[PDB]
């Protein structure tokens, strides 16, 4: 597919609460709540290690996903992501 339909068969199973409960746990990647994953705020949540990062390296999990090219993702798009590899079977 593209990446539309993406988180339709990803929500089927995420059903309406399984989202909003998400939702809360959606602000540990941005800062306080800035409803986004931009590799501005990403490359820190896993370079929160405290190493410099490399521009690759917060921009190899952009186009894993964010294929419009903003370089950023919300936690719609971000659910689909762990809906991957589901260890239930995939």
Same mark, same amino acid.
């Given at each position: 597919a593209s990446?539309?339909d993406?988180?339709?068969?990803? $929500?089927?199973?995420?059903?309406?609460?399984?989202?909003?409960?998400?939702?809360?746990?959606?602000?540990?990647? @941005?800062? @306080?709540?800035?409803?986004?994953?931009?590799?501005?705020? /990403?490359?820190?949540?896993? $370079?929160? /290690?405290?190493?410099?990062?490399?521009?690759?390296?917060?921009?190899?999990?952009?186009?894993?996903?964010?294929?419009?090219?903003?370089?950023?993702? @919300?936690?719609?798009?971000?659910?689909?992501?762990?809906?991957?590899?589901?260890?239930? @079977?995939?």
């Amino acid at each position: 597919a593209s990446m539309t339909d993406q988180q339709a068969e990803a $929500r089927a199973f995420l059903s309406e609460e399984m989202i909003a409960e998400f939702k809360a746990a959606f602000d540990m990647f @941005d800062a @306080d709540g800035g409803g986004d994953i931009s590799t501005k705020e /990403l490359g820190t949540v896993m $370079r929160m /290690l405290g190493q410099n990062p490399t521009k690759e390296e917060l921009d190899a999990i952009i186009e894993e996903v964010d294929e419009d090219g903003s370089g950023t993702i @919300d936690f719609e798009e971000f659910l689909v992501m762990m809906v991957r590899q589901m260890k239930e @079977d995939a």
